[PDB]
Every structure is written in structure tokens, then in C-alpha cells.
Symmetry: C3
Subunit: 290 residues, 3 copies
């Protein structure tokens, strides 16, 4: 007989205090219309879910038979092929809904939702797990994505992360931050191996990165004197005079005719003259005369 | 009759091998005193939880009736309105506790705790899920928080993240890292849109950021010659002499009286003289005489 | 009697629509051989798991009795002391497996796996939760690890994160990014408290950081004139001439003999001479003569 001769078997289960396995392939609703959680708890009422302390159920593997909930605040719930577990009372309600790897209507796949309703003053609502399929949106350890084809290939609106970029024969590190908002939504740093150089570029509105990398100056990548508007030492040394003097003496017995660069330095009879000389970078030169 | 005429219904359930729905609104404990997990498993013993392979339960929606556990090592568990599921033996024990959106005593809301006790040499203890309500403490993708009112508004002790800061008419990107410890617990970078400048500031002990932004020098924001203690080229060019010579000839038939800047260059009779001239930035000048 | 006088008690449970508590300490398999999920669902068939809408089970606390699954794509599942819950049909299958704090065969401890098999065209497979024991691999808020003993102690291949490093008497902030791949797999920034300096170093292949920190130049850490290859202003000022003139007059009644630095400037009788003088940094000097 094996209990097949039991009237009101659902009441029996309640009396014995056993968990209610309500259905393995039930169609939750008529069709895949959209339904609210108030309508979901109404449908649970009509099947007697709150008559049992634990009451489970599994939506049929048919998209055209099962509702979808749309007011969770943490993603849609497609009841097609969804496990529904109901714990508590109609007063103090706990539903745990486990979704499968495929859905319709925008349902979150590979998820466990949990619904509490302990009264309207006690914050009713839904929550969703994080898992290896539905990760938390967090900056990843390790490498984000796959290697991109050139150093500028990470788009301004990609996930923040550490990326590898091909530069031909080697590759370079791209450290990308993006917040999807603001006048500057993103910044990227390019880093070459073995302190080979570090650079940044930053975005603008929805226009991406309009400027080329700016290389950051460091003690292994110092500015040049021209970068800062100055001369190098060698450029100063080759232009400006450091000394003036009179050169070797010449004389004549009398007279001394004007000679390019020469000045009279003595009139003993005899006239003495020397060239004016000036020094640039250690080298002396004779002055000339117009 | 519907099994209402069954003595020892709990034993019946065990014999039939069905999961035990023990109560929908039980008060777990006398009051909201603090209790240990040893006391929690003792209370489970006294209700016969380990007599069944699966044994569930749901604490009453009354804070003044239900215990709270405090030794989890992953947050307090308020049993008020908590689902308690017990799986295994008193020897090899697994409890899954699902908490609702509100608690007392510091209970973690919106949580699923799991307790293993397979023997004291086999690492007994608690664990807690991560979910959309109780996220993992991880650097967020996208924007952290809301837009702040000025570029220095992200406090040194805020969560690491990418923030947007109003700068009046536009906004700027603030990249903030904080580890809550050490002589320098935090660093922030300010990044202006379209490579408009990148800056950092870093904190000290619990004192925050005592120095203003330091702008980082780059190939689009190069130091000036004055920044590095040097002259610009134009400043050198306007100060230092590049050439010396004698200017145009004057003569007199005899004599030549001392004249400011002039030197005698010939005594043919006739005396010849020229001015000393020097060159600065291409411009010649006559020397003077004291 | 208490149902002890029931033939085919498993069929009874199915007829009454109650969840099947199949065993509290069953050995799932013969030994700890490796098994596939096809073999796992076959073993579930032979115990009648899919005969019930909810069917639970708990592997015995004996490593030498229970299988381990190895094809999940999200870590091994050691059934020793594992809770197995089976929901749905053999057609539309949902298994939730909860593992304890210790395993063998490489099983993931402290985990909840979920398996869907709704048909081979509907993406069968496994997923695993994230929780306080098995966190998601994400850049951590706050401090990563413990304080390290010197500023270069964070290895190139450690988790990206914010670290604190002892520098003797104080400590410094190390911001580390590592993607485990590429010619430059990692970059670190060192940040000193109160804008005391910011530096980077970057790795190469598997060789780590071969170069010392490069300090980044900023408006509080400007390059020197020598860094950029230039002279300082004081170095220019002390080397190069800014003016030339003739000094005070000397005269003699006649004559004037050649005198170091002196040139004849007048022949009234009487000869007048002055020294050539040049100016460096405001100081005048007398020229000499070879």
C-alpha cells in the first residue's frame, strides 16, 4: 500500500513534521509573463507553501510555462528550471531560489537568490550570491583579460585591471583604472620592463584618450637641458667668454701702423703693441678690428 | 485521520527516512543572551536535531526570545528569524544558518553561515558567504562612492578605489589607496582629463595629508629652467659676452686725448684709435672708461 | 509501531511528497578513487536520488571510503564528509554539494558547489561560491599581508595589493601590481609619508626587479641643474664675463713702458694708459699680458 491510500497527503506531511517535496517539474505560472514578488508569494499561497516549515519546488524546464520576477533590485529571476525553497511562515518568510545555467527574460543564470519578508517595517527584499560564474565586480588579482595587440588597445571604458600589451617582440604592462563617469573617467599607466620607462594617459568625457602617452620623468629618465629651456654646460662653454688679456708683444723702431686686433701698449724711439685676446672654452682667440 | 493518530511522530519520520521540518516559528533559547557554539549544539541536542540526517528549524521573529552566537570568527549570528539547517551526525556535523535583513546583538544580516564540526582535530569552525548585501572587501570596479565636492575631499582612511571629485564646472579623477596602517597609510593620485596633469599626495600616521598635491613632471608638464636652478637660454644670451673686437678707426694729425672706451692703435705725425666693443646676444656695445 | 512496519519506505516517502533524508553517514563510493560527474550521477541513480524531488545525503567521515570528482572546472570535490543535495529530475538536475573544513584528493574545503544538468545543449556544469574562507581573487581593500621587513621585500610574483614595509624606525607604503605574465609582469611604487617621495620599479620576465627604485620627479622633488646637464645660475655667474671696460687713468711725462694689462689711450709730451678690466659676477678684474 505504501501510503498510496492516504487522503489529504499534504496535511499528513504537516502533522508528521516532515519537509514538503512539492514537485520536481511543476510549471510556476501560466506562461513567461513578468510577475512581481507579491504575485510570486500569492502563487506560493495558492499551492500551500506557507502551510509547511520547509516547502520546496522546482520550476519545469520549459521557458514558455514559468514566470519571471523583475523587481528584485539584484537581477531578474527566471523560474524556468529554478529551485524554489520556502522556509518559515507567511508572516516571517525566507525564499531561496537557485537558478540554472540558462534562462530567459533576462534571468540571472548560475545564481542563488534569497528573499526575506519579515514584515514591511523590517526591510523586505532580495539578495544574490557571488560565485565563480557571477563574480563580484572587483579589480582582479593577476592578469585582466588576454594580451591585447598594441600598447593603446585597452579601451577607456574597459574594467580597471592590470593588462599585458604586445609591443612587437616583447610586451608592456598597462595599468588601467576606469570609473565610467566624470570629466576624466579613466587613467592608464604604461610600464616598460626593468624600469624601462613609465607613462600615463587620461581620458576625457566619452572621447577616450586624445593625447599620446606622457612619459613621467624619473632619476633613470631625466629631462634634457633643452627640455627645461636651458643650455647644456658644453653649449655654455662653447659660446661665452671666460677671460680677456693682451697677447705677445711686438715692437717697431720709429712707426706702428694700425693692425687688426692690436693696441699700442708702450712708446719707449720704439712703439710696442699687443693683440687683444679672449678665451672661450679654454681656447684663446685674437680680437679683430672693423 | 491523516497521521494525527501517530505516537512519537519524530521517531516515525526518522524510520521513514524523511527530512525533519522541526518548527516554523520556534524560539531558539530563552532570551537574547549571548551563547557559544557549544551551547548552540547543546540546544540542538535537546531538540533531537542530530537524530535526523537533515533537521531544519526557524527562529521566531522575536528578538527577546532568541540567542545570539558570538564566537564565530566571522561575525555574530542572531537566531531571531534565522533558518537553522542541521545535516549529518552529532559526530560529523554541518549547520547552515540563513539570517534575515534585520538583526539584534550585532548579528550579520543578509548572510548564510556554515559550521563544520567533524572532530576537534579536523578544524571545527564557521564561514560566511559573500553576496550583493555583504560584499567582499575588495577594490571596486567602476566608481567608488558618489562624486565628492572638491579634489581633496576623499579622506585618507576611506576605501581604496577610483573616485570622481568636483572641481567647478568640470571634475577630476582621484585614485586612492589606503591600508589603514604604517607611517604612510595612504596615497592619492589626482588625474586631470586629456593628460591635463597628474599629481600625488601621501598621508602620515593618523594625520592625513599635510602637504599639498605634488605635481609629477612629464613630457607634457616639463620643469622650467628656474625649477632646476638654471638660466634659460635667453637669460644666458642677454647676460654674457660672446665676442670682443676693436671698432671703427678714428685718427688725428699731431694729438689723441684720452677718450672713453678708445685705445690708441697706431702712431703713423698721426695717431689712430679705436673703441673696444663687446658683443652680447648679437648686439655690440662700446666699452667705457672709469 | 511508528512506521517501522512499512514495506518499501522509500516509495512511501515519494507518495506522501516528503523530502528524502537518505543517509547521515553513507560512504559515497567504494574508495577514494577519482570519479567523473557522469559516474557521480550514475551512483546517484543506483541509490534512487532522482526518484525524489529533493534527495539529500552526507558522505561518511572517512577519506578511504568516498570518491572525489575531478572534472568540475572549478576545483575537485572530495565527497568524504560532504553533504549532497539533489533537486529535480534525472532530466533537469540540480546538485548542491557542501564540503567541510578538511578534504583529501585536492578537494576544495569550506565550499558550496552547484551542478546543473538540464540537457547537453543547455550548458551542463559546476559552479562554486565565494566565502570568507575561499575569497574571490580580488585586489584587497586595506592592507594586503603583514608588514614586510624592508622596502624591497614584496616579491614580483606576490598578489597585487597595498603593503607596508619597515624602513627602520618608520615604514613606507608599497603599491604592488602583478599579472604573472608578459615581459613586464609587475610594477611597484614606493611612497614615503607626507609627500616624502614617490618611486617605481618594474620587473622583467621571471627575473624580478633588476633595477633599483627610480625616483619620480615632482614639484617637491625637482631635478638639479646637473641632473639635466646644465649649469646652475651661480655656476654661470662665476664663470662668464658680463662687461669690459678701461680702468683708471695713469700718465707719464715724456715714456710709457709696456705694463701688464695696460693700453695707451692718449698721447697729449704726455702719454696716458689704462688697464683693460673685465667683470665676472659683479667683480671687476685687471687683464694681464703674456
Amino acid at each position: 500500500q505504501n501510503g498510496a491510500d492516504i487522503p489529504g497527503k499534504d496535511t499528513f506531511t504537516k502533522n508528521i513534521g516532515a519537509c514538503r517535496a512539492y514537485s520536481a517539474w511543476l510549471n510556476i505560472g501560466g506562461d513567461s509573463q513578468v510577475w512581481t514578488t507579491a504575485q510570486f508569494i500569492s502563487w506560493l499561497e495558492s499551492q500551500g507553501a506557507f502551510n509547511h516549515p520547509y516547502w520546496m519546488c522546482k520550476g519545469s524546464w520549459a521557458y514558455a510555462n514559468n514566470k519571471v520576477i523583475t523587481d528584485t533590485g539584484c537581477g531578474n529571476i527566471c523560474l524556468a528550471g529554478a529551485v524554489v525553497e520556502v522556509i518559515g511562515t507567511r508572516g516571517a518568510m525566507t525564499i531561496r531560489v537557485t537558478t540554472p545555467s540558462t534562462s530567459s527574460g533576462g534571468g540571472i543564470t548560475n545564481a542563488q537568490f534569497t528573499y526575506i519578508n519579515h514584515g514591511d517595517a523590517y526591510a523586505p527584499g532580495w539578495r544574490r550570491d557571488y560565485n565563480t560564474k557571477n563574480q563580484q565586480p572587483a579589480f582582479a588579482l593577476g592578469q585582466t583579460g588576454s594580451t591585447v595587440g598594441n600598447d593603446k588597445a585597452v579601451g577607456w571604458n574597459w574594467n580597471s585591471g592590470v593588462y599585458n600589451a604586445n609591443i612587437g617582440g616583447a610586451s608592456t604592462l598597462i595599468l588601467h583604472f576606469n570609473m565610467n563617469t566624470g570629466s576624466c573617467p579613466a587613467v592608464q599607466f604604461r610600464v616598460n620592463y626593468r624600469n624601462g620607462g613609465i607613462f600615463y594617459r587620461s581620458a576625457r568625457d566619452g572621447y577616450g584618450f586624445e593625447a599620446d602617452w606622457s612619459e613621467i620623468y624619473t632619476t633613470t629618465r631625466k629631462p634634457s637641458a633643452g627640455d627645461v629651456g636651458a643650455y647644456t654646460q658644453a653649449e655654455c662653454n662653447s659660446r661665452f667668454i671666460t677671460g680677456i688679456r693682451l697677447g705677445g708683444l711686438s715692437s717697431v723702431q720709429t712707426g706702428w701702423s694700425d693692425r687688426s686686433g692690436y693696441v699700442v701698449t708702450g712708446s719707449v724711439d720704439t712703439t710696442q703693441a699687443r693683440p687683444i685676446q679672449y678665451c672661450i672654452n679654454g681656447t684663446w682667440y685674437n680680437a679683430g678690428s672693423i
